[model samples]
Target: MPSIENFLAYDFWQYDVIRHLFAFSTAVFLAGLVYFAMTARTTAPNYRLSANISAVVMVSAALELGQLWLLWNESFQWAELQGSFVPVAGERFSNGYRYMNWLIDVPMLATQLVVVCGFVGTELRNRWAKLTIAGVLMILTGYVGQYFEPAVAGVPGYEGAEQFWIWGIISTAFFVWMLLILANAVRNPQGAPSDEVRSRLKFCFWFLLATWSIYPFAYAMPLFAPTADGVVVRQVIYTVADVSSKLVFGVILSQVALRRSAEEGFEPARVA
Candidate 1:
């Protein structure tokens, strides 16, 4: 096998450009979110939703930074070990980033469940519950890939017998709860104040649904190919989805929050 360093040198310029772009964009978005969270004051009852979205953005930015660091630190050796033409090192960095990124899902899932219980449960509609159930099922399907991923157990210096089981159980439960909440939302669309509110909620639903749907494919890519090829494909897909989803989510959440008062036929008030 060729060394990792030789592999990285083949298309190092392209890799560098992509890595930097991911890092820079993530940073800008996260900074903007922090500013908004700290300064914004409004009567939106969905402040928790906004906060959760921001938290996910910040965590994603951290994951990007981690990938950039790995590329900078290991690109040389990674290229040589793999092959000149291969970009597996960057891929591995991305996978590592993704594994860490799952941590953010924990809280996001929790919030989803809470929101559904508070709003959707009160309405008690079967359609909403079904949607939540479907969402949970999809989330679990995605976790199936994560649970079997070799990267989790293969990390250096942290190899353990229970890593997969531990992480899998935690991730699975959280997503299941999230799906249940989504179902509630579907059942009780009337919980939202207006068609616009429902539209915003739909934005969140589809965004998350699309993300979970693609995640399994990305996670399983490595199993179908040699390590490096798999990682490269996975990284490409993961990065694209991560960036696009966050951007859409931020816009959707902001728009909904800003319009909440107007939609409800009241003036916005300070959140004392």
Candidate 2:
């Protein structure tokens, strides 16, 4: 874990920005859990696992973001002298919790894609294995780099810089590998129910690529803009990335599953 240190004091608005973003993220994911659970039946029984996985991911993400919001609140207090919020004594705010959450959600996310693609038998097992391995290694390596992050503003190449860079690069390599695996699977999905379903799967590929890239951007923020404002920007980036990559991504997966189920003649029954 990077165990980040929030050394910069924040103005009232800046602090609230981060606080509200975390709250927003938590709300989005928690609400997503109920939405996915309800909609899962619209998917074919064979592929419904994707929607269930989405629900599982949503709850884990929601809980972690909720805890993070609480952590942010407890880690700081207002300082009248600086007219800003300063760290609470002996309390440190860290980004480690996010990586821990990813450890649970990331692999599940990749597996969800494999399931939605309709892979079966050995191909299913093989893709699932590769995706989960790459997903996990990527998160773990990134977690290692978290410890060496230079948390102080205006500090260039701190003592931990070397280790941080090394691990960060290693983590990025795994991320790229995971993307390649996803791209290849989605590019020509033989199991897709229709051309439209295939197209949506392709869209998911690009969406994941775009949203997931924001993480490295925020991860590298300390190297360039390690000030109070920088911290705010990073938090905003993180919140946006989380909402899009997990919540919206789940919605997209649900759409793909629903469309495939409809194509396969699995319609929702109505009692009224």
Candidate 3:
């Protein structure tokens, strides 16, 4: 936590680049709150899971808020930091918070996708367990890759940047595999979501698929370029994908969940 004075001094609106991120985070926060209210007020018995899904979106928003504070705490846009060839302490942004956020959000996002597919019994348990675990592992490996690349680059006379590629391949492989599993389920879902729900799922699934596929390339920029340009571009690409995958993608799940919650004619006040 930053001291109150530091927080106050953090020039949040000074940099055009980072200011864009702050703006997007604020927008997502407002949307998440609205979705949470709508989901919570839903009178349908089936809405508990949906309401919880919206709640997670709100959490993701809060995490972004934390990032805004960190961006300030680290002096992220300080000309000194950005001009440095590589990240150094108190100069570049610390991404520890992002890893923490993803550890929670990724699995939640995966589970909601499974939940909306309406799997039940042993199948439900299996899909949710396997796929969610896969999502976590993918995120973990990607973080490892990110951490190692910088270390290898910064180390004394070492050419070990390939460490990132090894972990990168594994991370992306798991992600693509998880997508395939979910895509299979989407194609042949079991039990009770409306055609409307199915259409929404398809679009969301593909959108996530297309967006996530770019992350690896963005992550690889530093390994290949190692310039300030690499850092800035990757950050831009990453923030965009993160919003699409978790926050924007979350909106898709929240909407589908609300519709499915009451689409079967559960009375607005019925909880039984």
Query: Relative to the true structure, how large is the alpha-carbon lDDT of every model?
Result: 0.50, 0.81, 0.62
Candidate 1: how large is its RMSD? 7.6
TM-scores for candidates 1 onward, in order:
0.60, 0.92, 0.75
What tens digits encode model 2's per-residue C-alpha lDDT throughout 175-204? 999899888888757553677888899888
Tens-digit lDDT track of model 3 for 232-265: 4555776777777766776676666666666767
Best by TM-score: 2
- Give the least accurate 10-residue stretch of model 3, judged by summed lDDT: 1-10
Let me know the TM-score candidate 1 reaches against the reference structure: 0.60
Q: Better model by TM-score, 1 or 3? A: 3
- Per-residue CA lDDT of candidate 1, range 43-141, in tens? 355444554555566566566555655654454433555444453433433344344455454344334433522344344344345444544554454
Pairs that clash in candidate 3:
none
Candidate 1: Cα lDDT at 223: 40
- Which is superior by lDDT, 1 or 3? 3
